[PDB]
């Protein structure tokens, strides 16, 4: 277990010490079963952090300023495929203001992507299309 | 309580009244503990509705034409986090035809995500892509 965390038996504690994204440990031990990450400043979780733990039974993620946006799509993507659902009943959002107090496991893709896109809605392929049509105008 | 519905104390009743996706009231009362929507036209539920009622115990959603796609993901997730699962055994997918007659609570998130086809839905513009490359060859 990393220095910011404390590994007691098969349980790991990484909460209540105000961990941010930058100071979050890069990787976790294989054998950990329960991980409590309560009371930090975690805006969103890095992709592939909680999906690489084979023995993870319950993870506590409450009491954090979760920012539900594009970068939070990973963590929610890991929430659907979980047998137990009790310790995720009251996960809340704190930003953006349009989605204040939204329960985390009840989020759709479009809602998370609306704030992800600065405003080019419906851009499934539009992003490079605008640039290249402008570029073709630029040529001739 | 909203005008199209009928409220009685904590309970709210909005069944058998031709209620559509756009005619749903924006926000039901916070205190509500049982909402019924049987025998309506609801294709899916808008996001942010079922999670704004923390006191909900049961909800009746049968006998409705549920389109099982990405937009219905907010409902299905709410269906997973319920202690009692008695009245959710008759939620069938009226559409798409790829998932005709499937019970909703047993639908994994794999099936619903694939319905809002990221590729198959859009490409009436596959010929448009071919046209981009072909007339770029014209320029080239």
């Amino acid at each position: 277990c990393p220095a910011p965390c404390s590994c007691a038996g098969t349980l790991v504690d990484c909460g209540r010490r105000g961990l941010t994204w930058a100071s979050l440990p890069t990787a976790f031990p294989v054998d950990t079963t329960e991980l409590v990450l309560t009371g930090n400043n975690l805006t969103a979780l890095p992709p592939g952090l909680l999906d690489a733990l084979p023995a993870l039974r319950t993870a506590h993620l409450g009491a954090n300023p979760w920012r539900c946006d594009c970068r939070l799509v990973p963590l929610r993507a890991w929430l659907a495929g979980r047998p137990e659902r009790a310790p995720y009943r009251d996960l809340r959002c704190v930003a953006p203001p349009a989605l204040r107090g939204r329960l985390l496991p009840y989020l759709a893709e479009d809602e998370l992507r609306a704030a992800c896109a600065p405003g080019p809605l419906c851009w499934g392929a539009l992003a490079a299309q605008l640039a290249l049509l402008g570029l073709g105008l630029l040529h001739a | 309580c909203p005008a199209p519905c009928s409220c009685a104390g904590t309970l709210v009743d909005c069944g058998r009244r031709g209620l559509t996706w756009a005619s749903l009231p924006t926000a039901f009362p916070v205190d509500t503990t049982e909402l019924v929507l049987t025998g309506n036209n609801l294709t899916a539920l808008p996001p942010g509705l079922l999670d704004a009622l923390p006191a909900l115990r049961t909800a009746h959603l049968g006998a409705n034409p549920w389109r099982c796609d990405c937009r219905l993901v907010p409902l299905r997730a709410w269906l997973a986090g319920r202690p009692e699962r008695a009245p959710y055994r008759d939620l069938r997918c009226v559409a798409p035809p790829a998932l005709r007659g499937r019970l909703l609570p047993y639908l994994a998130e794999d099936e619903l995500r694939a319905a809002c086809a990221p590729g198959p839905l859009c490409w009436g513009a596959l010929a448009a892509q071919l046209a981009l490359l072909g007339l770029g060859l014209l320029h080239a």
């Binding site: 392929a125 049509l133 073709g136 | 839905l121 490409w123 448009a128 320029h139």
Partner: peptide, 22 residues
């Protein structure tokens, strides 16, 4: 279809500007 409709007019428009170039 719909989500490509907004750039449907846009592929053809830059494409026709290229037709002007040719």
């Amino acid at each position: 279809d719909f989500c490509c409709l907004l750039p449907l007019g846009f592929y053809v428009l830059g494409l026709f500007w290229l037709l002007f170039a040719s």
